[PDB]
Structure formats: C-alpha cells, structure tokens
C-alpha cells in the first residue's frame, strides 16, 4: 500500500533502479539495501539484462544524502546492536556487489551524493555527475568513519594531489563538499552530463546491446 522504498523498472534491455525516499533525501536503510542487493543478484543471472542504471526519483534535489545512520543511533541508545549490525552488513555487502558487478552499472549522481550515496557511485566505473552534483563525506562531524569502501576508492581514483592519498585524506578528514564540474575534474565522477540530457541518455543506454557473440560482461 505504501510506496516501495526502491522502485525497479525495465528500460528495454536496461534495468533501472530508482531510490524512492524523497522525504529522507533517498537515505539508505536496511530495507532498501537488502532489496537492491537481492534484485542485483537476479539481474546478474539474467541473460536479457545488459546494464543497470542506479538513479533517484528526487533529482535534482538529491540522489542519496547518505546511509540512514540516525536510525542506527537510536539502535545504539536502545542496545539494539543486532539491528545496527544488520544495517551495515546489508549496506556494505551492496557496496561490495556493485564494485565487483560484472555488468556495467551507470549511476546518475543528479543531486546530493553524500555518504552512502558515494558508495553507490564510487564503486562504478560509470558514475555520471551533473551541475547539481554535491559530493561530500561528512562523517567526521557525526563521529563515524569514511565507510562504503571510500578508503579503498578515493586513494585510487582521485586525479590531483593524490600521489600519497593526500587529496583522499583531505576530503575524508575535512568533509569538504565538491560540486559538479569540480567532482568530474577530481576523479569523483567519470563523466559530466547536463541534467537535461539524462532522459535521452537513459533511453540510449537501454537501446545499446552487445554485438554478435559478445556478452554484456
């Protein structure tokens, strides 16, 4: 009866995953993570799905404002540590699945991509940014650590002043927000596409298919 937290749809041979928690800026809870993790395993087995597209239904307001840590805090105050460990096992397992996924995943970072949102894009070779992109890792102000494999990605993908992870440490320790073109130039975003062009891009992604006897992997 209630609107599902994550909506799954078919786009020709592309499968679109849309985060559907607009009031929470698409915050990721255990339910969302579990649903996406299970549905991605099915798409990996399927021979009719060529690529996946992870987007939000709230763009350009936000793509993912971060994992739902406020709920994890209440668990700690209530000693519901089993619930908290379930939230992180689901989220981190989904970030590991995306990183090692054999089919192309294309994340549309059209909006605030902070925290868990970074985990949804940092692990994909096709992480598209827009003028509305706002990448940040504001965990140092909440007392947490740089999670979602950001300590394995940022030290390996940043482009400038990252010979010894200097820039990676600057973003993770200061929580600086990077916006649009700057995210693309730093290596946080693989591509820079105008938000107006995302609809057209989505359609083209659904229409392309591996040629002859080549699999999508």
């Amino acid at each position: 009866t209630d609107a599902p937290p994550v909506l799954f749809t078919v786009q020709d041979t592309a499968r679109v995953i849309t985060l559907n928690r607009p009031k929470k800026l698409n915050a990721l809870n255990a339910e969302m993570s579990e649903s996406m993790f299970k549905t991605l395993n099915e798409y990996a087995k399927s021979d009719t799905t060529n690529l996946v597209i992870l987007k939000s239904s709230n763009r350009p307001r936000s793509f993912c404002a971060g994992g739902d840590v406020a709920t994890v805090a209440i668990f700690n105050f209530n000693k519901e540590f089993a619930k908290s460990i379930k939230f992180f096992t689901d989220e981190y397992s989904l970030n590991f699945q995306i990183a090692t996924y054999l089919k192309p995943i294309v994340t549309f970072m059209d909006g605030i991509t902070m925290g868990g949102g970074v985990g949804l894009s940092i692990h994909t070779p096709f992480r598209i940014a827009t003028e509305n992109t706002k990448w940040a890792m504001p965990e140092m102000d909440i007392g947490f650590f740089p999670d979602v494999g950001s300590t394995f990605a940022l030290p390996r993908i940043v482009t400038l002043a990252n010979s010894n992870s200097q820039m990676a440490l600057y973003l993770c320790l200061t929580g600086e927000v990077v916006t649009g073109a700057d995210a693309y130039m730093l290596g946080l975003a693989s591509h820079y596409v105008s938000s107006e062009n995302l609809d057209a891009l989505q359609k083209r992604l659904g229409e392309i298919s591996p040629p002859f006897n080549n699999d999508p992997q």
């Binding site: 009866t1 799954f8 299970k38 395993n41 099915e42 798409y43």
Partner: protein
Amino acid sequence: LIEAFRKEEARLLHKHEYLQKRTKELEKAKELELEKLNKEKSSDLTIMTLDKM
C-alpha cells in the same frame, strides 16, 4: 446368494469411505500445491510490479 448380498453391501460401504478419503487427500494436496505456487521465489524480484496503484 447370502455371500452376494453381504459382499455387495460391504463393497458399497467400502466405496463411500474410499471416496471420502480420496477427496480429502486431493483437497489437502491442492492446498499444498497452491501454497507452493503462492510461495515467493527470488526470480519474482525481476517481475515488474505496481502494487500500490
């Protein structure tokens, strides 16, 4: 003739009991089969749905 009348009555009564037992079995099997059909599988995640609407 006495054996014929008593065997026929026994057969008729035994046939009613067998039908009742058989029907109940079939009914139980149908419920089980239907329950398996309604069981959610992992493949169901790949079937698009609009439950709310």
